[PDB]
Symmetry: D3
Subunit: 157 residues, 6 copies
């Protein structure tokens, strides 16, 4: 029974994230999206709002489930009987940074990490940049799933 | 049901490669190692030699097989009913180059690519560098599987 | 009637920035320097002031403060090009995403120029940090800014 | 009377190149595409030909072959700007050295533009390699080049 | 006669750092480890603790001494009659950032910087990441010298 | 007695190289410039011509000597009782490539590598680009030492 965990804050989930979810779900028997809460940086959406937006956007992925998590990511992964993390990468800079975390995670817990390259169309999309653009009235509707931009309107007003 | 292809020239396979094979075999139901041959440029080892060296050092991986091929990698993958490539990466430079190839491969054939970070211990190991060092008498024993080391020194002499 | 906008915080403006201004003014009929009001050592007005003195010899350049989306600043003045300097591959990877976002949302393009070799290590932040602990940044900043920097720390 | 030169081997010209041509023509009064005669699949004349057909709708652009120093090509036509597309940070680091060399020896500046996201993975060499082994590169090349590519391999 | 300064916050020193100290001490007549303190932001360990942890794990290096400092690194270096900084680097990203600092340091004070590549085994080790992993219960024992591990777990509790 | 080897083809030596030589000679009791011959790529200048140009350019560095070398670099270094290599770096890309060679050299022979950042003024200078520019009539006189550009005129005519 194969599987992997896709970690992130997803505040909010973007089409870049969604593309990674779809690609992981096509290759693993199960995927768990882990919505990670930092009590320092309270973002725009609550953890429940983020989970709901991810579930709506992944409605057609039957082997994908979404949960919140806290603490050590590798503990979250092992607690669920898995030992793989899947993450999207956009740049070589991203790779150099994630490489250190991947090696640390494999060292401390034997959990592996599989990376996928961003889809070309979403290479410049990030939750943070989309929010910043939207805050000043930019149209990011083509960068976010449908279930998100509606809720994003509400938060900005 | 789930599966991946691990491609390369493997001339010869290194411990860096074997680490990637082992990690792929742990996460996918089957792995096929694709020894890709350019029919116009010969390398150091024959196809038979390349395949034998990989088989000898992967005997403990029951769900891994080894095959040679040529032409487009995505055709090799799809012909076998698979849809995933797994590749190791050492550097950000590697990632930027492989990103292009992975995006092209997804574009023309819908085949996805999963990258894994090199094991720290083997981060500087490459077939080409190991051959070059060995050519001038350097000690590469701890970098190559036993199935490879004496076959390499044999070629060199 | 070509034109480009050179955006930044410019706190203060360095010779590195000035070099980009000069090169942009040489290739576009009109250049506007956009001081984006956001950290901070100088007032937006002093920044603008400091840029204005360093740029006296450039007839087709002017300096304006800005708020909100950079692409709105650019389009509201009838332009659709941004010119920015780059020092490193890391800079490029970061800037590429903003460039692509800006083109996507507003059709504003971005042209990058390589740093002058002499100014490869110059940044507003590093120049401040070094001047803070008494280091000589004279050769890195416009004469204009150099005095106002010494007096801002004294 | 602004202007820029877009240099390359263009063998063949890709939609990635075309996108840069379009963006350069939008910001400079005059753009010259320089086909530098140096590997090779198409003749310099076909390359030039193939670029000319893809660029019909751009009135301020022309296509010329070139030999020797790029900066001499640029200056001999009265210009001192080069426009080139960049995909990656690795590209930038390589191109930065040539940009700085070109500025040093001839005072010719270089403006870089970020690849369009859709064409991030498109290169002349990769498109050829894939078309060689039967892959469909239709959506990546101009309709002009696409037929001449199919007939060049058949 | 020849000498170098190895600077850092060392909060705490890691095996990655100690590897750099050892390699510097092998190549220069003397090495001074400079524990640079920001008087406005405290870290996890006091200056006394930082110095003690480094001394305890460098006892076998007769030509290495440890001192704290603050303000400009180049003043610390020149005051001691030296003219060289030695720093470890892990990534190309690190190199691009440190290049700027090294060129500035040479510009303002004529002080040169020599970089050394990280040991492969410690390529993913950083004080900050080790603290973060330890904070959430991860096993960082093989990444830190013995002089550090129990002092860190003590702080955390 | 401290020391390091500065390897390269130096065909011809540039001011970028010279800057590295000067900086190594300021920090090590002795520096050996190793002019490495590849029988495949016969460059523009013979090995003796290159050594002569380097000696003339380093005339004021009394602790620097110049020799030709072949074979494994780490053997060259150890044969002369040293165990350090000094190399200049221009870019993060250069660092990622040299990092692998440095780790390999330390693995196979215990020889370390110290890198220095390029001087800002010479960041875009390389022997290959200077030759290419000069070949088509570009003025590279400000990029090369005096003892070189004269000989470079002769070779081009
Ligand atoms: N356009 C895109 N394509 C592919 N992957 C992407 C992507 N945008 C983001 N990702 C990936 O999705 C991960 C999770 O995204 P987010 O949750 O929004 C960032 P975060 O980890 O919560 O905060 P951070 O910025 O401090 O790292 C990122 O770390 C990145 O790996
Ligand atoms: N030390 C290492 N750790 C992890 N992966 C490695 C590795 N060394 C090589 N690899 C991977 O193994 C792949 C195949 O290596 P080789 O067969 O030796 C040369 P290649 O097949 O021509 O690779 P390339 O053309 O994709 O660059 C590399 O592309 C790289 O992805
Ligand atoms: N030495 C240099 N040469 C060429 N361009 C430079 C340069 N230094 C900076 N620039 C460019 O000019 C822009 C403006 O820089 P500044 O606004 O003064 C500081 P900043 O790095 O932008 O702050 P930030 O990182 O917090 O956003 C930079 O973002 C960069 O694009
Ligand atoms: N997808 C893309 N988007 C934007 N610009 C691109 C691009 N692909 C290529 N370019 C730019 O257009 C230039 C011309 O490329 P080409 O001449 O066709 C192949 P090349 O990479 O230059 O060959 P070479 O590497 O052997 O020198 C590239 O050097 C690059 O600067
Ligand atoms: N695993 C490793 N291998 C080699 N060198 C390392 C290393 N980890 C850290 N270093 C080096 O040791 C230096 C000091 O590390 P630390 O004191 O922990 C944070 P720092 O002092 O704030 O570094 P920085 O500000 O220069 O980025 C780093 O700058 C880096 O050069
Ligand atoms: N401008 C510069 N500043 C600092 N260091 C430089 C430099 N130009 C070159 N170097 C360094 O000097 C070394 C030797 O230079 P060269 O001998 O000319 C290259 P090479 O190793 O002979 O051939 P190669 O290009 O196949 O690597 C380079 O590997 C590089 O480390
Ligand atoms: C949330 C994240 C995955 C951030 O990485 P990301 O930016 O790729 O999403 C990382 O911070 C994390 O793993 N948090 C859980 C705590 C942890 O395991 N830290 C140690 C990572 S080596
Ligand atoms: C280009 C490459 C060397 C890379 O794959 P490999 O290093 O794993 O063998 C080659 O073997 C391959 O993957 N396929 C053969 C030609 C091809 O597939 N070209 C399209 C790459 S997008
Ligand atoms: C100010 C700046 C240009 C960054 O400039 P800087 O790198 O000089 O700090 C960028 O942060 C910006 O555009 N701010 C205005 C708000 C905006 O346009 N956000 C969307 C960026 S895609
Ligand atoms: C042709 C090109 C622009 C490279 O273009 P390309 O990346 O598209 O192949 C470059 O090789 C060139 O300028 N050739 C002409 C000779 C020259 O100018 N050499 C000095 C470069 S600094
Ligand atoms: C910026 C830095 C953190 C880097 O040095 P460090 O990481 O080795 O401690 C700092 O401690 C330092 O080197 N000096 C203190 C301020 C300074 O020197 N600024 C000038 C750097 S060019
Ligand atoms: C000549 C050089 C130093 C090239 O590196 P460089 O480009 O930095 O000069 C390298 O090829 C070399 O070391 N040649 C000697 C043979 C050798 O030792 N090869 C193994 C290097 S790990």
């Amino acid at each position: 029974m194969t599987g992997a965990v896709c970690p992130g804050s997803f505040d909010p989930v973007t089409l870049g994230h969604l593309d990674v979810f779809e690609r992981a779900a096509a290759q693993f028997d199960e995927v768990i999206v882990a919505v990670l809460i930092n009590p320092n940086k309270a973002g725009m959406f609550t953890v429940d709002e983020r989970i709901e937006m991810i579930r709506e956007s992944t409605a057609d992925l039957p082997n994908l489930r979404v949960e919140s998590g806290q603490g050590l990511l590798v503990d979250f992964v092992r607690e669920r009987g898995l030992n793989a993390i899947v993450k999207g990468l956009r740049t070589g800079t991203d790779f150099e940074y994630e490489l250190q975390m991947a090696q640390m995670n494999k060292h401390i817990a034997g959990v592996d990490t599989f990376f996928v390259a961003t889809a070309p169309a979403y290479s410049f999309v990030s939750s943070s940049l989309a929010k910043e653009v939207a805050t000043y009235g930019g149209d990011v509707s083509a960068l976010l799933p449908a279930s998100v931009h509606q809720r994003l309107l509400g938060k900005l007003r």
